[PDB]
Amino acid sequence: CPLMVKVLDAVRGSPAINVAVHVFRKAADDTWEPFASGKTSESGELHGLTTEEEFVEGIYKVEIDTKSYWKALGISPFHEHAEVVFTANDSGPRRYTIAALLSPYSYSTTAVVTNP
Amino acid sequence: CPLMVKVLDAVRGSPAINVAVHVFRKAADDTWEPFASGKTSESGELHGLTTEEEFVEGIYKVEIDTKSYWKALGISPFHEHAEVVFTANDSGPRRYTIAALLSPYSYSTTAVVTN
Amino acid sequence: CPLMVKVLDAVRGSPAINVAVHVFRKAADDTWEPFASGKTSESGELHGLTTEEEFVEGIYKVEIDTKSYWKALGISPFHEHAEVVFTANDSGPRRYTIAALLSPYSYSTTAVVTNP
Amino acid sequence: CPLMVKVLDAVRGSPAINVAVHVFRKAADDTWEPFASGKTSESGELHGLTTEEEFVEGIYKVEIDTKSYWKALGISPFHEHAEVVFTANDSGPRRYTIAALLSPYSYSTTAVVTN
Numbered sequence: 310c311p312l313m314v315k316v317l318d319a320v321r322g323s324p325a326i327n328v329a330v331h332v333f334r335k336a337a338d339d340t341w342e343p344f345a346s347g348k349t350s351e352s353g354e355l356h357g358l359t360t361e362e363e364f365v366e367g368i369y370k371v372e373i374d375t376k377s378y379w380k381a382l383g384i385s386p387f388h389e390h391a392e393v394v395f396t397a398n399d400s401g402p403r404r405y406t407i408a409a410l411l412s413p414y415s416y417s418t419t420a421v422v423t424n425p
Numbered sequence: 426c427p428l429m430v431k432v433l434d435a436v437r438g439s440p441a442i443n444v445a446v447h448v449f450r451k452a453a454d455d456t457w458e459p460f461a462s463g464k465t466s467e468s469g470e471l472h473g474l475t476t477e478e479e480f481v482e483g484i485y486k487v488e489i490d491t492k493s494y495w496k497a498l499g500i501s502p503f504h505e506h507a508e509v510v511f512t513a514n515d516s517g518p519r520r521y522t523i524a525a526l527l528s529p530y531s532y533s534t535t536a537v538v539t540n
Numbered sequence: 541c542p543l544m545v546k547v548l549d550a551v552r553g554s555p556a557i558n559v560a561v562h563v564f565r566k567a568a569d570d571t572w573e574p575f576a577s578g579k580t581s582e583s584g585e586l587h588g589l590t591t592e593e594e595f596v597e598g599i600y601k602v603e604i605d606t607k608s609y610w611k612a613l614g615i616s617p618f619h620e621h622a623e624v625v626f627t628a629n630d631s632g633p634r635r636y637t638i639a640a641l642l643s644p645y646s647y648s649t650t651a652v653v654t655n656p
Numbered sequence: 657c658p659l660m661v662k663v664l665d666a667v668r669g670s671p672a673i674n675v676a677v678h679v680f681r682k683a684a685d686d687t688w689e690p691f692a693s694g695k696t697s698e699s700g701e702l703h704g705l706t707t708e709e710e711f712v713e714g715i716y717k718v719e720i721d722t723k724s725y726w727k728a729l730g731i732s733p734f735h736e737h738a739e740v741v742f743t744a745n746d747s748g749p750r751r752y753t754i755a756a757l758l759s760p761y762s763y764s765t766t767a768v769v770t771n
């Protein structure tokens with residue numbers, strides 16, 4: 310699959326499990342349209358969001374619901390969510406891994422982009 | 426200075442200078458409305474965005490134009506920008522520093538909330 | 541395997557390939573003794589460093605040769621290496637993933653620690 | 657101030673205060689020898705470690721006692737410490753800030769090298 314999301318908890322040193330993830334694609338009229346969504350699994354990974362056919366060129370937004378994650382663990386975090394916005398498939402189809410590393414007052418995001 | 430933004434460059438090991446920063450506040454119709462903006466100085470810092478009277482509780486977005494920065498350096502970037510979204514709450518501490526550390530395919534952001 | 545190392549390049553958005561990794565274990569006399577070593581593969585991962593039998597409790601050091609990596613890419617980086625030092629297996633055997641995310645003047649390291 | 661260390665806490669969103677920091681210089685027999693040390697202030701900063709005359713080219717280690725910090729907060733940490741090792745070179749810029757951002761199972765360190 311062309312798009313995968315992986316989330317890690319920097320406080321517990323574990324995958325961040327059951328984290329909600331919403332993906333949007335920028336429409337011709339410049340609005341964000343719902344593209345796909347899901348929950349991270351026991352391994353902190355979210356697979357199967359889309360397909361090579363559906364994941365065309367465009368600007369995508371991946372919004373990770375970090376706030377609900379921390380609140381379920383009893384922590385009141387700083388951020389409302391982590392939001393990753395990028396142009397995809399601009400030089401042909403690629404595989405994208407979006408990784409986020411979460412702490413209550415900080416997060417980091419990296420993309421690993423490989424060929425098919 | 427209730428809100429300061431600081432940007433660092435992980436490739437060159439330097440302040441990220443002349444980086445455009447826009448700040449928005451969530452309006453009651455769920456739309457982002459522009460609030461403040463500027464460009465980081467030679468020290469990679471952006472001071473004077475707002476004041477204590479203006480910076481009321483609310484949900485705020487800080488959008489950092491990382492793509493233009495990397496473009497000025499001739500390095501292909503992954504992200505369109507870095508967007509930091511948070512609720513400002515009064516009972517907590519009085520000053521917010523939003524720090525971001527930039528790489529072409531990665532960024533990290535941290536809030537340092539004091540006083 | 542109980543210990544795995546994963547290295548990512550934050551400039552190219554790719555796994556960091558052929559990165560040298562040296563693992564040491566603190567001896568009774570407080571010196572660092574050579575424990576294991578290897579190179580990251582095409583996926584930026586290094587598997588097979590040790591075994592459940594050999595990976596006993598102790599203080600371990602994982603030294604990642606980031607400087608040779610950047611220099612081979614034409615970059616003169618800040619750090620000599622990235623060095624991760626931790627107590628392992630103190631409450632029984634665990635699986636450790638040591639991940640490092642590399643930029644020329646910055647790096648981050650995280651541990652994902654799971655049960656067998 | 658040729659060398660400054662700054663430490664931030666990613667769990668609390670605050671300067672990491674009272675954190676012990678030791679600095680070593682590689683000696684010709686490959687051994688680390690103590691050079692300077694201190695504890696971070698209320699702003700999470702450690703100033704005055706060395707001087708321009710003393711801080712000659714060499715290989716240096718900055719060891720940050722992150723484990724004691726997390727222990728004082730009652731949070732189980734993964735690392736024994738954070739160890740930042742670098743070559744100081746004169747032709748480059750004149751001032752080094754070693755910044756570290758701490759979480760219990762993760763840290764990041766960046767060098768900001770200016771003037």
Ligand SMILES: O=c1cc(-c2ccc(O)cc2)oc2cc(O)cc(O)c12
Pocket residue numbers: 431433522524525526533535537662664753755756757764766768
């Ligand atoms: O030099 C600084 C570095 C950082 C920083 C920014 C991002 C990181 O991942 C780690 C540290 O934050 C800061 C926050 C401040 O309020 C002031 C700083 O100098 C810094």
Ligand SMILES: O=c1cc(-c2ccc(O)cc2)oc2cc(O)cc(O)c12
Pocket residue numbers: 315317406408409410417419421546548637639640641648650652
């Ligand atoms: O792609 C990955 C990226 C990371 C990672 C490493 C460092 C960061 O600051 C953020 C994410 O950890 C990982 C850990 C794994 O076990 C597997 C991964 O693919 C990743």
